[PDB]
Design an enzyme around this catalytic site. Structure first.
Site, PDB file in Angstrom:
ATOM      1  N   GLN A   2     -31.855 -80.881  -1.655  1.00 54.65           N
ATOM      2  CA  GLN A   2     -32.674 -79.761  -1.289  1.00 54.65           C
ATOM      3  C   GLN A   2     -34.109 -80.184  -1.011  1.00 54.65           C
ATOM      4  OE1 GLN A   2     -32.369 -75.594  -3.014  1.00 54.65           O
ATOM      5  NE2 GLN A   2     -33.906 -76.459  -4.399  1.00 54.65           N
ATOM      6  N   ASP A  41     -27.588 -71.310   3.080  1.00 60.66           N
ATOM      7  CA  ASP A  41     -28.724 -71.275   2.148  1.00 60.66           C
ATOM      8  C   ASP A  41     -29.405 -69.888   1.942  1.00 60.66           C
ATOM      9  OD1 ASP A  41     -29.900 -72.930   0.243  1.00 60.66           O
ATOM     10  OD2 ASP A  41     -31.575 -73.470   1.496  1.00 60.66           O
ATOM     11  N   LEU A  74     -31.920 -70.157  -1.043  1.00 64.43           N
ATOM     12  CA  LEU A  74     -31.260 -70.230  -2.342  1.00 64.43           C
ATOM     13  C   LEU A  74     -31.686 -71.509  -3.091  1.00 64.43           C
ATOM     14  CD1 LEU A  74     -27.580 -69.068  -1.648  1.00 64.43           C
ATOM     15  CD2 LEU A  74     -29.513 -67.793  -2.619  1.00 64.43           C
ATOM     16  N   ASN A  76     -30.608 -74.510  -4.983  1.00 60.80           N
ATOM     17  CA  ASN A  76     -29.333 -75.183  -5.060  1.00 60.80           C
ATOM     18  C   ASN A  76     -29.590 -76.652  -4.648  1.00 60.80           C
ATOM     19  OD1 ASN A  76     -29.598 -74.874  -2.182  1.00 60.80           O
ATOM     20  ND2 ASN A  76     -27.918 -73.426  -2.051  1.00 60.80           N
ATOM     21  N   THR A  78     -29.014 -78.034  -1.559  1.00 61.43           N
ATOM     22  CA  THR A  78     -28.948 -78.220  -0.144  1.00 61.43           C
ATOM     23  C   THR A  78     -30.098 -77.482   0.491  1.00 61.43           C
ATOM     24  OG1 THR A  78     -27.567 -78.103   1.815  1.00 61.43           O
ATOM     25  CG2 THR A  78     -27.395 -76.203   0.347  1.00 61.43           C
ATOM     26  N   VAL A  80     -33.289 -75.797   1.967  1.00 58.63           N
ATOM     27  CA  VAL A  80     -34.643 -75.591   1.463  1.00 58.63           C
ATOM     28  C   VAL A  80     -34.631 -74.720   0.223  1.00 58.63           C
ATOM     29  CG1 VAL A  80     -35.732 -76.115   3.713  1.00 58.63           C
ATOM     30  CG2 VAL A  80     -35.185 -73.705   3.080  1.00 58.63           C
ATOM     31  N   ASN A 154     -51.714 -64.355  15.748  1.00 62.54           N
ATOM     32  CA  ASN A 154     -51.913 -65.725  16.150  1.00 62.54           C
ATOM     33  C   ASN A 154     -52.900 -65.801  17.283  1.00 62.54           C
ATOM     34  OD1 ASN A 154     -49.950 -66.417  14.231  1.00 62.54           O
ATOM     35  ND2 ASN A 154     -48.314 -65.956  15.716  1.00 62.54           N
ATOM     36  N   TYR A 170     -53.823 -52.243   9.318  1.00 59.10           N
ATOM     37  CA  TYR A 170     -53.860 -51.027   8.450  1.00 59.10           C
ATOM     38  C   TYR A 170     -54.253 -51.314   6.989  1.00 59.10           C
ATOM     39  CZ  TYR A 170     -51.482 -48.633  12.279  1.00 59.10           C
ATOM     40  OH  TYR A 170     -51.077 -48.175  13.514  1.00 59.10           O
ATOM     41  N   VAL A 173     -51.692 -52.355   4.260  1.00 61.99           N
ATOM     42  CA  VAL A 173     -50.828 -53.529   4.471  1.00 61.99           C
ATOM     43  C   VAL A 173     -51.679 -54.793   4.207  1.00 61.99           C
ATOM     44  CG1 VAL A 173     -49.496 -54.810   6.212  1.00 61.99           C
ATOM     45  CG2 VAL A 173     -49.486 -52.280   6.258  1.00 61.99           C
ATOM     46  N   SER A 220     -46.733 -65.717  10.970  1.00 56.20           N
ATOM     47  CA  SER A 220     -45.407 -65.172  10.664  1.00 56.20           C
ATOM     48  C   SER A 220     -44.728 -65.971   9.607  1.00 56.20           C
ATOM     49  CB  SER A 220     -44.498 -65.197  11.899  1.00 56.20           C
ATOM     50  OG  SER A 220     -44.653 -63.983  12.624  1.00 56.20           O
TER      51      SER A 220
END
Ligand SMILES: [Ca+2]
Ligand code: NA
Ligand code: NA
Length: 274
Positions: A2, A41, A74, A76, A78, A80, A154, A170, A173, A220
């Site tokens: 991972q 994953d 996840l 684990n 493997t 990421v 961006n 806003y 947010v 993002s």
């Protein structure tokens, strides 16, 4: 094996996960292009699609799958590892295959998420103007207790021009800007009074269809680090209001320089979740 993308220790999410808080039973909605739910994953437990022709649990673009992985890949041996890898992950498709969506598709996803009791909404999307319905939807979601996080944009900087897009702009947010591995502001990161915190956004490696892993740049990629951070904080202090979670991330961030370019600076989740 991972890999642990640089962004995870840089916001000190790894310190929080070692305490044992991993976002478990926190509900996070990713409002994007969908998620490749079959990716080994990611575990997607529900969602909805407001985009004609496409089911919520596929992602022909890649964008929503990558953002989901930053929140919740996840834990684990493997792939990421996400910021809050035990979260309940919901895919709310509001953007098409080319990465674009209408205001009402977006409004619909936000309302679906407030109605379906999400704890955190991540919006890695933005535009120059917003709308009356979108404003009401983010405001209603925040007033009902949802933490609402969006990419700042961006558009870089250019003199004193405000370049923060909507819905980040806003008040209800959190507008997230992007830094790189050296914790420096990435050049594309929008700027303005509304910018609130920074997270990792340049060189972010995450889940990507089909069943692989890829690196993207943009605010993002920065936004979900904060959505994951919100989920870790709630997993540790389940009774905080959305407002208190927002304040913790805000006030404990690492100062980087002028707020116009950085807001309050880089998030530190170990400090926020104290
Ligand atoms: Ca993994
Ligand atoms: Na999966
Ligand atoms: Na805002």
């Amino acid at each position: 094996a991972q890999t642990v993308p640089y962004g995870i220790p840089l916001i000190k999410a790894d310190k929080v996960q070692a305490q044992g808080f991993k976002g478990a039973n926190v509900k996070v909605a990713v409002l994007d292009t969908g998620i490749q739910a079959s990716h080994p994953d990611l575990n997607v437990v529900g969602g909805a699609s407001f985009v004609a022709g496409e089911a919520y649990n596929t992602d022909g673009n890649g964008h929503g799958t990558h953002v989901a992985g930053t929140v919740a890949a996840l834990d684990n041996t493997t792939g990421v590892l996400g910021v809050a890898p035990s979260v309940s992950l919901y895919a709310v498709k509001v953007l098409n295959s080319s990465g674009s969506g209408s205001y009402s598709g977006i409004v619909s996803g936000i309302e679906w998420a407030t109605t379906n009791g999400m704890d955190v909404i991540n919006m890695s999307l933005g535009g120059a103007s917003g709308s009356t319905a979108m404003k009401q939807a983010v405001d209603n979601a925040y007033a009902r207790g949802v933490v609402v996080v969006a990419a700042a944009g961006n558009s870089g900087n250019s003199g004193s021009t405000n370049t923060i897009g909507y819905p980040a702009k806003y008040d209800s947010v959190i507008a997230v800007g992007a830094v790189d591995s050296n914790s420096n502001r990435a050049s594309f990161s929008s700027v303005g009074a509304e910018l609130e915190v920074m997270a990792p956004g340049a060189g972010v490696y995450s889940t990507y269809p089909t069943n692989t892993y890829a690196t993207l740049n943009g605010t993002s990629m920065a936004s979900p680090h904060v959505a994951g951070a919100a989920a870790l904080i709630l997993s540790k202090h389940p009774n905080l209001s959305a407002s208190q979670v927002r304040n913790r991330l805000s006030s404990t961030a690492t100062y980087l320089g002028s707020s116009f370019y950085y807001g309050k600076g880089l998030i530190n989740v170990e400090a926020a979740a104290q």
